[PDB]
Design an enzyme around this catalytic site. Structure first.
Site, short mmCIF file in Angstrom:
data_model
loop_
_atom_site.label_atom_id
_atom_site.label_comp_id
_atom_site.label_asym_id
_atom_site.label_seq_id
_atom_site.Cartn_x
_atom_site.Cartn_y
_atom_site.Cartn_z
N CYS A 1 -3.84 15.81 -9.16
CA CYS A 1 -5.39 15.91 -8.85
C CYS A 1 -6.22 15.66 -9.97
O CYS A 1 -6.14 16.37 -10.95
CB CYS A 1 -5.01 16.83 -8.05
SG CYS A 1 -7.33 17.19 -7.01
N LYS B 1 -0.75 16.43 3.45
CA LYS B 1 -1.36 16.57 2.70
C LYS B 1 -1.21 17.67 1.68
O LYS B 1 -0.49 18.79 2.38
CB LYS B 1 -2.80 18.09 3.91
CG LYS B 1 -4.08 18.15 2.60
CD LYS B 1 -4.38 16.94 2.11
CE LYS B 1 -5.76 16.93 0.96
NZ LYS B 1 -6.42 16.29 0.02
C1 LIG Z 1 -9.27 10.82 1.35
C2 LIG Z 1 -8.13 10.72 0.48
C3 LIG Z 1 -7.29 11.92 0.35
C4 LIG Z 1 -6.49 12.27 -0.56
N1 LIG Z 1 -5.16 13.08 -0.77
C5 LIG Z 1 -4.05 13.27 -1.82
C6 LIG Z 1 -3.29 14.03 -1.76
O1 LIG Z 1 -3.88 15.19 -1.07
N2 LIG Z 1 -2.49 14.08 -2.32
C7 LIG Z 1 -2.07 13.00 -3.04
O2 LIG Z 1 -1.06 13.08 -4.03
N3 LIG Z 1 -2.86 12.19 -2.76
C8 LIG Z 1 -3.98 12.11 -2.20
N4 LIG Z 1 -5.15 10.78 -2.24
C9 LIG Z 1 -4.36 9.61 -3.19
C10 LIG Z 1 -3.43 8.34 -2.40
O3 LIG Z 1 -2.57 9.70 -1.82
C11 LIG Z 1 -2.91 7.21 -2.57
O4 LIG Z 1 -2.20 7.65 -3.91
C12 LIG Z 1 -4.50 6.40 -3.36
O5 LIG Z 1 -5.35 6.86 -2.80
C13 LIG Z 1 -3.69 5.20 -3.94
O6 LIG Z 1 -3.61 4.17 -2.78
P1 LIG Z 1 -4.79 3.67 -1.85
O7 LIG Z 1 -4.92 2.21 -2.76
O8 LIG Z 1 -3.49 2.97 -0.42
O9 LIG Z 1 -5.70 4.33 -1.29
C14 LIG Z 1 -5.71 10.88 -1.52
C15 LIG Z 1 -6.82 9.60 -1.27
C16 LIG Z 1 -7.62 9.54 -0.54
C17 LIG Z 1 -9.07 8.31 -0.96
O1 LIG Z 2 -8.97 15.67 -3.62
C1 LIG Z 2 -8.46 15.65 -3.06
O2 LIG Z 2 -7.82 16.39 -2.09
C2 LIG Z 2 -6.99 14.47 -3.89
N1 LIG Z 2 -7.62 12.58 -3.77
C3 LIG Z 2 -6.95 12.32 -4.59
O3 LIG Z 2 -7.53 11.06 -4.84
N2 LIG Z 2 -5.87 12.26 -5.40
C4 LIG Z 2 -5.28 13.79 -5.32
O4 LIG Z 2 -3.98 13.82 -4.88
C5 LIG Z 2 -6.24 14.72 -4.13
I1 LIG Z 2 -5.40 16.81 -4.25
#
Ligand SMILES: Cc1cc2nc3c(=O)[nH]c(=O)nc-3n(C[C@H](O)[C@H](O)[C@H](O)COP(=O)(O)O)c2cc1C
Ligand SMILES: O=C(O)c1[nH]c(=O)[nH]c(=O)c1I
Ligand SMILES: Cc1cc2nc3c(=O)[nH]c(=O)nc-3n(C[C@H](O)[C@H](O)[C@H](O)COP(=O)(O)O)c2cc1C
Ligand SMILES: O=C(O)c1[nH]c(=O)[nH]c(=O)c1I
Lengths: 313, 313
Positions: B131, B44
């Site tokens: 983010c 995370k």
């Molecule tokens: C619940 C959740 C938490 C996420 N937390 C992070 C994070 O801590 N850091 C980050 O770089 N991306 C975060 N993302 C973005 C995902 O890493 C990813 O880049 C994005 O969801 C698109 O891929 P997907 O279409 O498979 O969801 C998060 C996405 C979701 C849905």
């Molecule tokens: O709110 C999140 O923790 C989160 N959620 C996202 O969709 N991308 C991110 O980089 C992050 I840091």
């Protein structure tokens, strides 16, 4: 129970219209839209001179929406002006005219000539600040300084109420900046959110190939892919510009999607990809669907829920 | 036939991993992703101090994807460092660590301490520049001067190979500028495209309400909504960064969607929303599906079709 609206000094049987670009390049297209149940129509975004656009294939549709890089094909400003001037039947519905010149000077030239027709006929201007598909021509409204210039020159040269077609933004600071730029121009009476989501890339698995020819497969997305982006921009600008109208565009296939748009703050609702795919018979479905939703909820007019999306806590 | 591969001085059994933020906040989470058949994991995104994140509800999923404004809840850099230093079994698969400090100084302070652990253990940094969800802190990588500043400072402080998590772009000039900023930094070995599509808005028709509580319902979109956007970004950076690796993330639900990411240029393929909804079993399905597609097409390696998407003329 009632879909009617009265705005920008015009009366509208219902809030539905085509999205600029769909079913509106030719006189044929424009007559068809006028004969539909839509509350209004907008013409194809136009340039001073006619344009062929990009090579085919340049549009493709899929279950979840569409990608395009048309490249601004149009019949030329002279044609759309003459259509507004002499051909359009304003007794049927209001007409918007979209202009999308490639420089501030081109747009100035166009609006100077549109002005007397607007005064005479009540045609409304939609200024396109968001074509994402002509190369080396990155979208005006992603450069706030350029956006300011366009709106100054066009306000000055036109001097009448108009609206602007905006691209989607994805960042709070960009909603902030963009909404403040717009609020500097009291002649901008409506904001259409949104144009396509720029430069997505669709790839066919069987053939290992992009599906549109121009720009190495890259083009604007519409349809189901972008509804939550559209609803966001609509509501972002609705909250940010309280003295303006917001027209919603993006991802509309049903009375429900139109309902959400309108909750988010939309006055007119534009239909692009779904109209391209289903044809102008879509407008009767959308009306009946929205009306059924209003009836079930006890809403009798649009203004009873426009802009009334609820937030939590 | 087997999909094993080598990158960044590490061996991987297959190109799949979780997307940062999904199934990786706690020790439990991390052991679960370690025991899955994924080829790697990422932790995370973290800050120097523990954070609770935004109020619930803050994630919602739907047939076409997800919206979130988690707001960076995490156990604190001290925890993920210790997991990296003492708890992860490197013999199972490699580990990426994601940092998302809220200023250059916070990131510099984190990477200064990660450096020795990375030397000792080979943990890989993924610097989060995107983010979209912390109020007052707009996405770093949509401000090129800020992005350059972060990459200069972290490069100087870390002095070791790292990657970047990019937000999606929607305009060619932005692709151009962004990839040229990256290309200024030899230590940036990989680029992860993309983070969630920022600040969408999902509305529930029956309740007339946004579905997440923070930021008036505005959050990042993942899932089926963003696949074409992700592909475009992956391919855009793949062409513009010939000397870096691109990691694909966005809209992966099947082996086909992975095949397309790889065709677009992806070395690794990350899975967010689909993993959140299906759980870690997804990794075995995705492997079998991708291998089935390879066999039917006569491919024996990833390297045969990586980045080989065809264009028209
Ligand atoms: C619940 C959740 C938490 C996420 N937390 C992070 C994070 O801590 N850091 C980050 O770089 N991306 C975060 N993302 C973005 C995902 O890493 C990813 O880049 C994005 O969801 C698109 O891929 P997907 O279409 O498979 O969801 C998060 C996405 C979701 C849905
Ligand atoms: O709110 C999140 O923790 C989160 N959620 C996202 O969709 N991308 C991110 O980089 C992050 I840091
Ligand atoms: C084939 C096609 C042509 C378009 N032409 C224009 C145009 O000329 N001017 C314009 O402002 N937008 C144009 N658009 C964008 C649409 O007006 C609309 O903003 C976008 O498609 C999103 O709505 P939708 O999701 O209903 O498709 C076009 C879209 C398509 C698919
Ligand atoms: O290429 C087009 O014709 C086109 N396509 C779009 O998706 N939006 C636009 O504004 C335009 I001017």
């Amino acid at each position: 129970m009632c879909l009617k609206l009265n705005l920008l000094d015009h009366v509208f049987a219902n809030p539905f219209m085509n999205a600029a670009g769909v079913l509106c390049s030719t006189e044929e297209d424009l007559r068809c839209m006028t004969a539909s149940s839509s509350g209004a129509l907008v013409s194809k975004s136009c340039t001073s001179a006619p344009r062929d656009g990009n090579p085919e294939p340049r549009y493709m549709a899929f279950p979840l929406g569409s990608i395009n890089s048309m490249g601004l094909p149009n019949l030329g400003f002279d044609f759309y002006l003459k259509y507004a001037s002499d051909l359009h039947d304003y007794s049927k519905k209001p007409l918007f005219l979209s202009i999308s010149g490639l420089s501030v000077e081109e747009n100035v030239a166009m609006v100077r000539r549109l002005a007397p027709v607007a005064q005479e006929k009540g045609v409304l201007l939609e200024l396109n600040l968001s074509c994402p598909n002509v190369p080396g021509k990155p979208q005006v409204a992603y450069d706030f300084e350029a956006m300011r210039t366009y709106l100054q020159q066009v306000s000055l040269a036109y001097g009448l109420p108009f609206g602007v077609k905006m691209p989607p933004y994805f960042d709070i600071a960009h909603f902030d900046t963009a909404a403040a730029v717009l609020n500097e121009f009291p002649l901008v009476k409506f904001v259409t959110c949104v144009n396509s989501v720029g430069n997505g890339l669709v790839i066919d698995a069987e053939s290992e190939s992009v599906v549109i020819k121009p720009k190495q497969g890259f083009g604007g997305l519409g349809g189901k892919y972008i509804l939550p982006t559209a609803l966001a921009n609509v509501n972002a600008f609705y909250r940010r510009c309280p003295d303006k109208l917001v027209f919603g565009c993006g991802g509309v296939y049903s009375g429900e999607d139109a309902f959400l748009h309108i909750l988010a703050g939309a006055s007119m609702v534009q239909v692009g990809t779904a109209l391209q795919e289903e044809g102008p018979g879509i407008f009767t479905r959308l009306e009946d669907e929205l009306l059924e939703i209003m009836a079930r909820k006890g809403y009798r007019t649009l203004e009873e829920f426009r802009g009334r999306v609820k937030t939590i806590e």
